[PDB]
Design a protein around this ligand. Structure first.
Ligand SMILES: Cc1cc(NC(=O)[C@H](c2ccccc2)N2CCCc3ccccc32)no1
Lengths: 157, 129, 36, 36
């Protein structure tokens, strides 16, 4: 039975729905805390939001360290070869400057909350990468990419 | 009353059903054979677009609700503003005002993105049928 | 109960209704302009 | 002279302008959805 629970959780199909219930949970709790009032210290629901990113950050660092190249300068460029992966880290960095500003008093506290509002507009278009697992969202998300090179690209004329 | 008004309300969801019940009776004719059947396959496209539609339309419904109105109590009425108020800002409006300018223009390329996507699913699909 | 939820459901079903009618009216002509 | 004719010309040229922009934005995607 211990082998059954071990082999069930280690499957990549099982790990998909096991983390995307946590991802849609991070989306809805972050929607909750922006609606809840701000104070000098974060509440219980805000404290689980911040720790969700900090545990994600160590997870991103093990992607660099446990990578295929061996040389340290080599395992920087190949990790930034993905268009989704490069814009992931700037949103984590925007969350971090948003945390320091929110921990300080007003008017810095309203400024840090504003940087949270450009975080939540990012995490929905982050999900599009997770969308392409299905038979219809494979093509549908990919044509958002080519319409992206048509919709800020119409705008010249 | 008030049970009598409740029973009349369930009559109102009956009459919305009996018109889409007629669609089965429609397919007897030479044109409503294909026309009703493609309502069936567009049914698996129009509550099936909406996974990525709520990604783009509701995200602005919670982003606007934090820049504007930042002192809201935790309640269910805030959740009522995430699908109804974005459908009702057709006439609505450091750099404190630049942040509404960026999200409004990104909404301009968002509702054009959603309209262009909803007229994308059907273009190929009407041709082999 | 949800007295205001019933207008919310019929308004959103109207949102997918007038988009349904507009998409259907631009559906009849797309094939028909091509063989002509 | 025609002081009000100049707003009339630019308003009607705007009528064929926002129809020009809408028709152009539904032009880029029509071919592109078909080979994909
Ligand atoms: C907070 C927060 C966000 C988050 N989700 C991700 O950012 C993302 C992901 C998205 C959906 C389902 C599962 C994971 N994710 C985080 C873990 C490292 C990683 C590696 C490759 C692809 C995605 C990914 N989890 O917690």
């Amino acid at each position: 039975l211990g082998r059954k629970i071990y082999e069930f959780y280690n499957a990549p199909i099982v790990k998909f729905w096991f983390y995307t219930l946590a991802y849609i949970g991070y989306l809805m709790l972050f929607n909750y805390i922006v609606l809840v009032k701000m104070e000098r210290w974060p509440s219980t629901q805000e404290w689980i939001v911040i720790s969700y990113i900090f545990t994600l950050g160590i997870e991103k660092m093990r992607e660099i360290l446990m990578s295929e190249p061996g040389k340290l300068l080599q395992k920087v460029k190949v990790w930034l070869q993905e268009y989704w992966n490069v814009t992931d880290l700037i949103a984590i960095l925007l969350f971090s400057v948003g945390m320091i500003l929110r921990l300080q008093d007003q008017p810095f506290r309203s400024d840090g909350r504003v940087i949270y509002c450009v975080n939540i507009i990012y995490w929905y278009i982050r999900l599009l990468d997770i969308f392409g697992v299905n038979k219809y969202l494979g093509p549908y998300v990919m044509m958002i990419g080519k319409m992206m090179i048509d919709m800020m690209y119409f705008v010249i004329i | 009353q008030p049970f009598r008004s409740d029973g009349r309300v369930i009559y109102c969801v009956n009459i919305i059903y009996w018109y889409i019940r007629l669609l089965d009776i429609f397919g007897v004719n030479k044109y409503l054979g294909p026309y009703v059947m493609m309502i069936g396959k567009m049914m698996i496209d129009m509550m099936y677009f909406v996974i990525i539609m709520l990604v783009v339309l509701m995200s602005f419904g919670v982003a606007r609700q934090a820049i504007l109105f930042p002192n809201e109590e935790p309640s269910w009425k805030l959740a009522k503003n995430i699908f109804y108020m974005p459908y009702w800002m057709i006439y609505g409006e450091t750099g404190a005002w630049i942040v509404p300018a960026i999200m409004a223009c990104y909404l301009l390329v968002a509702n054009i993105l959603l309209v262009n996507l909803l007229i994308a699913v059907f273009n190929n699909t009407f041709f082999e049928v």
